[PDB]
Design a protein that fits this description.
- Chain B: This is Insulin A chain.
- It is classed as hormone.
- Keywords: hormone.
- It forms a dimeric assembly.
- The complex is a heterodimer of chains A (22) and B (21).
- With 22 residues, chain A is mainly alpha-helical.
- Chain A is 55% helix and 0% strand.
- Chain A contains one helix and no strands.
- The termini of chain A are far apart.
- In chain A, 5% of the residues are buried.
- Chain B has 21 residues and is mainly alpha-helical.
- Chain B has one helix and no strands.
- The chains are: A mainly alpha (22), B mainly alpha (21).
- Chains A and B meet through helix 1 of A and helix 1 of B.
Chain lengths: 22, 21
């Protein structure tokens, strides 16, 4: 993911990662 | 837009936090 294009399911995966919280 | 910034182009994961609704 480092310096990678984030599209579709992979963008979704990153978004859930960043926005997840306790 | 997130697609233009992160899919079309390269963005850091830090730049995704702006789209946490």
């Amino acid at each position: 993911f480092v310096n990678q294009h984030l599209c579709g399911s992979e963008l979704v995966e990153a978004l859930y990662l960043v926005c997840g919280e306790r | 837009g997130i697609v233009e910034q992160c899919c079309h182009r390269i963005c850091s994961l830090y730049q995704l936090e702006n789209y946490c609704n």
